[PDB]
Write a protein that binds this DNA or RNA. Structure first.
Lengths: 112, 104
DNA sequence: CCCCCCCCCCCCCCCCCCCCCCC
């Protein structure tokens, strides 16, 4: 598991309540989507120049349930995970790719 | 950056020479594809886009199997393809408080 | 080490974009 580092650290708020589901053979998989905003004002004072980014975080086991029990819409949380892009096929049988921050082995989540 | 933190840190090797391009006013956009793997060997590919100065250096000194350290943000952009189907794509972008660095 | 995954950021002086499958 050497050959480099895959690390993403996030601090942000949930868009909606955690969407927990069960994976085959003992579920415990919680999908949360969080926002991080950023600001600036490049071409002349625009009184604002916000820009929200949405991240798709996925927790497993213990943490999946913790989020399930204590994370609600607004919760602010700290996340440390790895990026993983998964390929899946859609209705029309076309190839799709989804990138996520999965909180696994050396991961971690924590309410703020 | 009101609201939280959005940051990704990668250390891996380019799977292919830097594909450098020059967008409109201000040509400087390099795209690289970084590989990071793990034994226990499952690898993951990353799309990192460098801009400006970082862009030129990537073009200048980075080559295929090169190992780099990257500090950036996570961005996912949507674009409809020649089919009328909405697509999304997330990449690590090295902008503001980000950095790139040649290792070894 | 890269075999490729993916079209492709716009902070931090002093909301919530929402589009997103099931490691």
């Amino acid at each position: 598991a050497s050959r480099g580092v895959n690390k993403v650290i996030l601090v942000g708020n949930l868009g909606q309540d955690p969407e927990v589901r069960y994976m085959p053979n003992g579920g415990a998989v919680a999908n949360i989507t969080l926002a991080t905003s950023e600001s600036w004002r490049d071409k002349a004072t625009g009184e604002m120049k916000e820009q929200t980014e949405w991240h798709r975080v996925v927790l497993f086991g213990k943490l999946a349930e913790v989020a399930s029990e204590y994370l609600r819409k607004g919760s602010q949380v700290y996340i440390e995970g790895q990026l993983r892009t998964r390929k899946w096929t859609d209705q029309s049988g076309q190839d799709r790719y989804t990138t996520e921050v999965v909180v696994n082995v050396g991961g971690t989540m924590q309410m703020l």
